[PDB]
RNA sequence: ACCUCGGAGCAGAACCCAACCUCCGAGCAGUACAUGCUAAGACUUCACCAGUCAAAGCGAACCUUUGAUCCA
RNA sequence: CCGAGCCUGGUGAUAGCUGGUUGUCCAAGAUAGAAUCUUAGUUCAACUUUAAAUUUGCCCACAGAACCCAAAUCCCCUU
RNA sequence: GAAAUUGAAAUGGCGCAAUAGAUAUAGUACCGCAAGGGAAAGACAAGCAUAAUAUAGCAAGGACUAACCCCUAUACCUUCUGCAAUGAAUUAACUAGAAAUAACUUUGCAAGGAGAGCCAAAGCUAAGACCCCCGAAACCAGACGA
């Protein structure tokens, strides 16, 4: 019974809408534009992870460092608790030493 | 629930179809069905030895009956046929006993003659 | 194996024979030939001059799926395999004997 | 050790290792012998000579020390008059 | 080069034809199934 | 950085290196990347040989 | 303790009665053994298992030809309770290249060049 | 479609207004 | 519970003992002496180990072909 | 009562071992004050730590029982 | 529900302890010394797996291994 | 676990879709003296009935003309050295391997690599692969309670 008895409504995808059609444009902004701009400057997203990557602990540390003062109170409390938990887990748990 | 299983119906049915002829809830409930289906398949796999073993026992019983009809014992029949270089196997000898009694009579007479 | 055979009989070999369907064949290892009133016994084989048993490849099939399951309790040991064996159905067309005794 | 520090997210160096072992760049670790300064008056001259020596570590000891130090301690250092400059590299080594 | 002639022969290179170089992508091992589940290593 | 018949280069390298080794050297020809990988260290000999060939 | 067994050399000194019984001439001895494993190496010491592997007798009832020389014989002595040894008999001599593919090992221990 | 204009560095010097509270302190000193 | 030895078990043991006695006899007559056999197989043994060493030292990654890389484009081959 | 080390039983014949256990003695004493310094090659108490032996060379003369790191 | 109330928070406390740890198929895969506030754990060793390099490895015939006063073992040309 | 020093530009979803996503239809109902806790839900599965049962037994398998009768067959998981012990009425849904130091593999470039910093005596850069879930008695802080 864990199965739907009707076909789901058809999902139509426009492969040639503007977003898909122009996807990838300016990814070579650096090597084709005399390196005035780095391609990572094209990234739109959270201010604390534009052109940067890390595990959950590093992401949380960076978020606290960069926008911690602007965070809501309980969100910041949750982030502090999460950093503490992730520190304990990554530095004290695991199969490997 | 980013990724959820949608095939569980078919995964369950693959086992339930083999369980459909069981007794009780073993034919309906997957938790019980899967255990009995595994046992059924293991029995099926192991029974290919017993089929061969029982067929030879059946052939030997039938040959013993047919040869006792002619006063021979099965060891005498088999051994003397071997000594006469007749390489008929037990399946064929049982078939001859059932369906060609005169041929089996000839074989029994030959075995007794060889013995004598 | 040894097959007890007569004309028009069907025989199921549990392997492929490298023969096209409808192809005629001579079964060369005849151990026994018998009639209502007499039988001939090879020691262990009858001669080619005496008997001629001919068959025809009627079918080339696979067997029904056979399950091989292994299970050992309390060892997380469970394995399943499905095997289909090639098969050939032969029809025995004729048995001929010759007066070469 | 600390695999991810709470302030930088970086792996930390166990400074007990740095205070005790010298790493040759090729991957060898040199150390002093334990007790080389202890109660020398009751040790034979041969034992004292053995204790005064700089000694290499095992493969597994070296692997442990490599894990316990970060890549900074495993770099090429061109010190002016390093006594270990010649020992920093291996020569005529087959496998 | 003969490789470019082979390209001329072959279908168009698109985003549906791309494949990583063999040996550059190890399979991911995850703890499901008889061999990698249970006590999960 | 090999262009053209990497297999011809492999044959030439084997011919040039077998007298040195006493056996035909074992090699891998990456035709895709245009590289030739030879087991063993022969960098100096191969550099001199390619200089003689004029590359 | 259980250890390797040192068989006294008198065990392997045939008597004229043995010669008559088994039909082998001590002068001009047979060149090759046919050894078959007839007993399981399970429940036997690791050294017997190793000797069986070395002699290539892993499969039971599968004849293996070996030289009748002291080293091979020492190994065979180590595993003599697990094997059957019979001399290889060559009534027509060793096979020639022409009939190398037409040989057969008769159950009597004779390699016949016709089959 | 036509691509949006390529991203470019803002030409000339960028002088943040010191009155704004959100301008970073490093953008106000003599080093900047 | 005690166990007892049957006539069949005794006969089986006797058969095995007879086989072993024949093994003793056939092992009692070496063809060569220990001094004669010394080194008579050395050349073949050396060649066999040379083959083993060659196999051990010839291990290397297999070749890679532009044809193999480019054949993957056929996954989108259609009928026009 | 013992906990470390050494010697003997306790292992008949390379080593290892009867742990637990039995007896004994050492946390040394005597000697010398090159009884120094260096250095090939080895042993090893089944890991490591530690512990042994040592040619050649240099220099004087002309050996028989334990404890790491840190810290002072 | 007091040998020390209840609630919230620190808190996903900690647990060398208990329990659980989800597709298919193949393959390799075994008891073992030391130290340890340590014997319900761990680290090293041994074993184990994968990849790699190279050349010898196992078995062993003699010869050889103590005086005090057994079965076997070690070692290695051959094979 | 620093600092000197160095100096980043600027309306969307490879998110969930009613056990998910907020606890939320709602801090409501309900529970508590109180502080507090805190929901549910809206659009031929199991269980039965049609149709109780037939000697014998992990309930099946080999079969068979034939359901049973014949023959073979000491449930599963986990924990024990191994069988005893643990867990499981059953269905549906949910429910548990997160990552670095090196390595290895595949690219790039190569005595140099890397889009400053770093490494380099073939290295450097990039990617791929690998480190679970539930559970105490507790401790402390601040409230709430005679
Ligand atoms: Mg497994
Ligand atoms: Mg002692
Ligand atoms: Mg040692
Ligand atoms: Mg109360
Ligand atoms: Mg926990
Ligand atoms: Mg296996
Ligand atoms: Mg302690
Ligand atoms: Mg414990
Ligand atoms: Mg909800
Ligand atoms: Mg139903
Ligand atoms: Mg229960
Ligand atoms: Mg009152």
Swiss-Prot record, chain D:
CC annotations in GO: mitochondrial inner membrane; mitochondrial large ribosomal subunit; mitochondrial ribosome; mitochondrion
TM region positions: none
One of the GO BP terms on file: translation
Residue ranges the record marks as coiled coil: none
Superkingdom: Eukaryota
Sequence similarity: Belongs to the bacterial ribosomal protein bL35 family.
Quaternary structure, from the entry: Component of the mitochondrial large ribosomal subunit (mt-LSU). Mature mammalian 55S mitochondrial ribosomes consist of a small (28S) and a large (39S) subunit. The 28S small subunit contains a 12S ribosomal RNA (12S mt-rRNA) and 30 different proteins. The 39S large subunit contains a 16S rRNA (16S mt-rRNA), a copy of mitochondrial valine transfer RNA (mt-tRNA(Val)), which plays an integral structural role, and 52 different proteins.
Listed name of the protein: Large ribosomal subunit protein bL35m
Organism of derivation: Homo sapiens (Human)
Gene coding for it: MRPL35
Range within the parent protein: 94 to 188 of 188
From Swiss-Prot, chain F:
Localization annotation: Mitochondrion
Tissue-specific expression: Ubiquitous.
Signal peptide extent: none
Coiled coil: none
Quaternary structure and interacting proteins, as annotated: Component of the mitochondrial large ribosomal subunit (mt-LSU). Mature mammalian 55S mitochondrial ribosomes consist of a small (28S) and a large (39S) subunit. The 28S small subunit contains a 12S ribosomal RNA (12S mt-rRNA) and 30 different proteins. The 39S large subunit contains a 16S rRNA (16S mt-rRNA), a copy of mitochondrial valine transfer RNA (mt-tRNA(Val)), which plays an integral structural role, and 52 different proteins. Interacts with OXA1L.
Entry's family note: Belongs to the mitochondrion-specific ribosomal protein mL49 family.
This protein's name: Large ribosomal subunit protein mL49
Protein source organism: Homo sapiens
Portion of the full sequence shown: 112 to 166 of 166
Swiss-Prot record, chain G:
Molecular-function annotations in GO: structural constituent of ribosome
Location in or out of the cell: Mitochondrion
GO cellular component entries: mitochondrial inner membrane; mitochondrial large ribosomal subunit; mitochondrion
UniProt key word Transmembrane helix: no
Keywords from the named record: Mitochondrion, Ribonucleoprotein, Ribosomal protein, Transit peptide
Broad class of where this protein is predominantly found: mitochondrion
GO biological process: mitochondrial translation
Subunit structure comment from the entry: Component of the mitochondrial large ribosomal subunit (mt-LSU). Mature mammalian 55S mitochondrial ribosomes consist of a small (28S) and a large (39S) subunit. The 28S small subunit contains a 12S ribosomal RNA (12S mt-rRNA) and 30 different proteins. The 39S large subunit contains a 16S rRNA (16S mt-rRNA), a copy of mitochondrial valine transfer RNA (mt-tRNA(Val)), which plays an integral structural role, and 52 different proteins.
Record-stated family: Belongs to the universal ribosomal protein uL30 family.
Listed name of the protein: Large ribosomal subunit protein uL30m
Gene that encodes the chain: MRPL30
Curated annotation (Swiss-Prot), chain I:
Coiled-coil portions: none
GO cellular component: mitochondrial inner membrane; mitochondrial large ribosomal subunit; mitochondrial ribosome; mitochondrion
One of the GO biological process terms: mitochondrial translation
GO MF annotations, alphabetized: structural constituent of ribosome
Localisation per UniProt entry: Mitochondrion
Record keywords, A-Z: Mitochondrion, Ribonucleoprotein, Ribosomal protein
The family this protein is said to belong to: Belongs to the mitochondrion-specific ribosomal protein mL63 family.
Name the UniProt record assigns to this protein: Large ribosomal subunit protein mL63
Name of the coding gene: MRPL57
Full-protein interval shown: 23 to 102 of 102
